[PDB]
Design a protein around this ligand. Structure first.
Ligand SMILES: CCCCCCC/C=C/CCCCCC(=O)OC[C@@H](O)CO
Ligand SMILES: CCCCCCC/C=C\CCCCCC(=O)OC[C@H](O)CO
Ligand SMILES: CCCCCCC/C=C\CCCCCC(=O)OC[C@H](O)CO
Ligand SMILES: CCCCCCC/C=C\CCCCCC(=O)OC[C@H](O)CO
Ligand SMILES: CCCCCCC/C=C\CCCCCC(=O)OC[C@H](O)CO
Ligand SMILES: CCCCCCC/C=C\CCCCCC(=O)OC[C@H](O)CO
Ligand SMILES: CCCCCCC/C=C\CCCCCC(=O)OC[C@H](O)CO
Ligand SMILES: CCCCCCC/C=C\CCCCCC(=O)OC[C@H](O)CO
Ligand SMILES: CCCCCCC/C=C\CCCCCC(=O)OC[C@H](O)CO
Ligand SMILES: CCCCCCC/C=C\CCCCCC(=O)OC[C@H](O)CO
Ligand SMILES: CC(C)C[C@H](N)C(=O)O
Length: 448
């Protein structure tokens, strides 16, 4: 019978949908920092490169934090499938805003649209994949690996296409390609979804009961009021700069798990997530810095004179696709969950330790071979194969899905503070210090 790589034919619709969404996101991410660099150079954007780097991180942190609202709203209010649709619409509008002939004024608007939009699409498109299988179907694990393979496939071709278009035609044309990428995703999703997806997910699966509406409304109103109240207090005492707001968003992003863990002999299990969560946060911190710190390194310290330097952002998902057939075989030919989160952290630690070598050996005033980043990403992706749901083979909801991206949000929130420490003069110290600390903790948190 007809399948998509052994999976229900509905996976391909979700496959292509998320592939084109990740295309739009990572296509934009591949040049957004360089764009901010450009806006500063022209004197249009009045921030430092350190703040611009910090923005890239807190943006990423808010993107995956936003998913928690989206997962909840779909399950209880609007539905999984309309959430994906309207999520993509906002994403597309976000990229269109950047495509418009404006400068720094369009940044915030674009960022908010994509944050909100991705919050709706990302956890729900991931949830709809599990809806293709009944409960005890062995293929479910394989279906997600294919799905993540599509995530990285879009993450691979996006910098290559968008980055090249940027260096030939300009940023606005490049950002318009990202919008088009999402537009393609909507088309395939809308028409393909009607054919392959359950109509059951056009309505919420856990609809708010009558008595539940007001408590939720009070909870939300108090949260927004308090947030606004904090903003007001900040503006009065003078804490109203851009890094000030990043600090606030950082604390909020970090306080949410702290309060979530503090919420929850069964308690020894909960305490046993604490080091696993830390290992995850630190790993995705290092991993997400590829689009910031490594992107900075690529542009400043690497000879990329015969190709767009944004193409280095294709190295991350390339290795995931390369490692995929091996690990898929490796797990069938052959480690606990805490170990994989530790060894994965050690590999990420080694990816930074390696990057300290060229500056220590050759100095930082010159340029080095692309192979250093290639090797560095090879190491960090090697550990990602131990965390990310790929290389797998032969039930839940949207909110619990979001909880998974929550460790990446804390990592980037952590990055929003840490990436400001990276520059030309601290290169060797930054890499070696944070790489060594990550290996040590990787060795500490496995025995712990
Ligand atoms: C395509 C490589 C896949 C190998 C997977 C195993 C993990 C290997 C990591 C290699 C460490 C990177 C060393 C490369 C390096 O730093 O040399 C650069 C310099 O020699 C340029 O000529
Ligand atoms: C630039 C503004 C673009 C606005 C989008 C155009 C709106 C046209 C039709 C709205 C359809 C919304 C329902 C789609 C949906 O819920 O997804 C489920 C689909 O049936 C396929 O799964
Ligand atoms: C329903 C929305 C679907 C539209 C998909 C996104 C396409 C939007 C615009 C495509 C054309 C954009 C032209 C880019 C542009 O204005 O360049 C101006 C110069 O490059 C400025 O240096
Ligand atoms: C936890 C994040 C919440 C994000 C904001 C949610 C929007 C604020 C309040 C919910 C809007 C009202 C719900 C609409 C609704 O479906 O009520 C109908 C119920 O079925 C009544 O039985
Ligand atoms: C900015 C914070 C305040 C945001 C308030 C947004 C809340 C929006 C609507 C909440 C009002 C209650 C809606 C109830 C509702 O629509 O129920 C539908 C009925 O079931 C109709 O059959
Ligand atoms: C979800 C719980 C939130 C609890 C945190 C309470 C708010 C505490 C501090 C306000 C946010 C930080 C303001 C920005 C700041 O740190 O100073 C700004 C810079 O130092 C000035 O350039
Ligand atoms: C089947 C893999 C297809 C290959 C696609 C990978 C291309 C994506 C990004 C290119 C990153 C730049 C790598 C350049 C490189 O490794 O050359 C190093 C040479 O030693 C140059 O001195
Ligand atoms: C197994 C994968 C590769 C692991 C790399 C292990 C190398 C560990 C540390 C390399 C960085 C050593 C720092 C050298 C250093 O600090 O020099 C100081 C500067 O030259 C300025 O004085
Ligand atoms: C489970 C796979 C683990 C793979 C680790 C094996 C890699 C071990 C050490 C790589 C260290 C890279 C340093 C290379 C180096 O310093 O050469 C300098 C330049 O090549 C000069 O031409
Ligand atoms: C330029 C590529 C865009 C073309 C549309 C996407 C279709 C192309 C390739 C589909 C590749 C599917 C590979 C799935 C895969 O290998 O992972 C499954 C393994 O079992 C992982 O455990
Ligand atoms: C934090 C990671 C799990 C995110 C992944 N690279 C994705 O785009 O889905």
């Amino acid at each position: 019978g007809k399948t998509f790589f052994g999976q229900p034919l509905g996976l391909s619709t979700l496959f292509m949908t998320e592939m084109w969404e990740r295309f739009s996101y990572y296509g934009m991410r591949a040049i957004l920092l360089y764009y901010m660099w450009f806006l500063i150079s022209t004197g249009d954007l009045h921030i430092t490169r350190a703040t611009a780097a910090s923005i890239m991180a807190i943006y990423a942190s808010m993107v995956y934090l936003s998913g928690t609202i989206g997962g909840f709203v779909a399950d209880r209010i609007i539905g999984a499938r309309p959430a994906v649709f309207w999520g993509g619409v906002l994403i597309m509008l976000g990229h269109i805003v950047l495509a418009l002939p404006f400068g720094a004024s369009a940044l915030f608007g674009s960022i908010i649209l994509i944050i909100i939009g991705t919050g709706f699409l990302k956890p729900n498109v991931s949830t709809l994949v599990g809806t293709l299988y009944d409960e005890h179907d062995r293929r479910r694990d394989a279906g997600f690996s294919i799905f993540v393979f599509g995530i990285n496939l879009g993450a691979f071709i996006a910098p290559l296409i968008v980055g090249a278009a940027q260096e030939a035609a300009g940023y606005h044309v490049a950002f318009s390609l990202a919008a088009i990428g999402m537009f393609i995703g909507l088309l395939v999703y809308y028409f393909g979804g009607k054919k392959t997806l359950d109509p059951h997910y056009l309505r919420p699966t856990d609809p708010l009961a009558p008595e539940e509406v007001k408590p939720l409304l009070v909870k939300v109103s108090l949260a927004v009021a308090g947030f606004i109240a904090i903003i007001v207090v900040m503006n009065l005492v003078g804490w109203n700069s851009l890094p000030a707001y990043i600090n606030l968003l950082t604390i909020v992003a970090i306080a949410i798990p702290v309060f979530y863990f503090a919420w929850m002999t069964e308690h020894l299990r909960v305490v046993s997530y604490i080091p696993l969560f830390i290992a995850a946060v630190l790993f995705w911190a290092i991993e997400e810095q590829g689009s910031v710190v490594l992107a900075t390194f690529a542009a400043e310290r690497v000879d990329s004179s015969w190709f767009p330097v944004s193409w280095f952002q294709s190295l991350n998902p390339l290795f995931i696709m390369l490692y995929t057939p091996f690990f898929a075989w490796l797990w069938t030919a052959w480690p606990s969950s805490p170990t994989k989160f530790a060894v994965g952290l050690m590999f990420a630690g080694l990816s930074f330790l390696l990057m300290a070598i060229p500056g220590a050996l050759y100095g930082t005033s010159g340029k080095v071979s692309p192979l250093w980043l290639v090797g560095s990403w090879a190491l960090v992706i090697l550990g990602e194969m131990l965390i990310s749901p790929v290389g797998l083979s032969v039930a839940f909801n949207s909110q619990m899905m979001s909880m998974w991206f929550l460790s990446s949000s804390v990592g980037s929130a952590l990055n929003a503070q840490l990436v400001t420490l990276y520059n030309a003069k601290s290169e060797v110290a930054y890499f070696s210090y944070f790489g060594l600390g990550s290996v040590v903790l990787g060795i500490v948190l496995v025995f712990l």
